[PDB]
Design a protein around this ligand. Structure first.
Ligand SMILES: O=C(O)[C@@H]1C[C@]2(C(=O)O)C=C[C@@H](O)[C@@H](C2)O1
Ligand SMILES: O=C(O)[C@@H]1C[C@]2(C(=O)O)C=C[C@@H](O)[C@@H](C2)O1
Ligand SMILES: O=C(O)[C@@H]1C[C@]2(C(=O)O)C=C[C@@H](O)[C@@H](C2)O1
Lengths: 117, 114, 118
């Protein structure tokens, strides 16, 4: 089957180093939890809240050996009033046979309050 | 195959109870029209126009029993001139066999004009 | 498997006649290069940088024969300091047996500079 994996993380500053570090760390954690290999990945979508401008989060994928052919595009998360600020989210679509209810979705930094289930 | 099921609806005011009620009603209808099982849904995207700020349309998914582990995420619709105001659109990806031309895509409220 | 194909192009002006023309061109080249049939497409997402408001690029899909039931939707590409301007991007999800490293992603117009290793 092919399924989606969700991740979320936050930076303390809209700085290219912290966006890339914190996105790469999110990506690593998902891959680790989900045993994901680059050729299992259909595509990835990364969103930033409307207050991060330094760099596109997807540049962090280029710091993962083997991931040069995984499709990615970024997007503006909608501007909700009360939304967790300075947040990056990933929806990674993967060829997998693990059941829906057993996929591991990662939530790091201040994002751990988004989905505490 | 896996295929996507498009939907769109419009709220009449930007407030949580309103956004979530109209998003949940769109989803119940998509699930109804295509007889969708949560375990059949790869992922779902929900976009709102930049004039809606009260709540993520996504939170409405959790009102559909059985849908907790379905991966949903929102994004913003681009502001297009002569665009439908206060509109919420979904792209749901389900594993299915029903031909492309027979997928039942759903447009509700003023979004019937899309 | 189902794999993602990627495209990007740029318009010179924010006019409907241009967003729809550059988006038709970009979709043709991807369909061509990858032999994509409309019934192999799972869905498509198109993003545009926040400086394009003339039209939704998904309307160009309608200009392609047989592409009438392919799901499309758009989103705002995040605004990045030094991002390529007036740019449209396509993430076309398709069912293909072609392998990852042979999928042809097609970058056109000023977008040639975004991923030059493809
Ligand atoms: O269109 C593109 O190809 C480029 C590359 C990019 C990436 O970092 O991988 C991927 C998606 C877009 O958000 C940006 C960043 O532009
Ligand atoms: O990243 C997230 O997981 C959270 C939860 C959310 C939901 O309401 O389900 C789903 C998608 C995101 O757009 C928002 C809303 O943040
Ligand atoms: O919801 C819709 O169906 C309509 C039509 C549209 C298009 O231009 O084809 C397709 C996708 C949406 O993002 C917009 C534009 O609204």
């Amino acid at each position: 089957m092919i399924r989606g994996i969700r991740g979320a993380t936050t930076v303390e500053r809209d700085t290219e180093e912290e966006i890339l570090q914190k996105t790469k760390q999110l990506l690593e954690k998902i891959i680790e939890e989900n045993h994901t290999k680059p050729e299992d990945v259909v595509q990835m979508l990364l969103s930033a809240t409307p207050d991060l401008h330094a760099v596109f989060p997807a540049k962090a994928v280029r710091e993962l050996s083997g991931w040069q052919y995984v499709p990615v595009t970024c997007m503006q998360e909608m501007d909700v009033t009360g939304g967790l600020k300075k947040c990056i989210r990933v929806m990674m679509t993967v060829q997998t046979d693990v059941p829906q209810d057993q996929i591991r979705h990662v939530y790091l930094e201040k994002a751990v309050v988004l989905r505490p289930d």
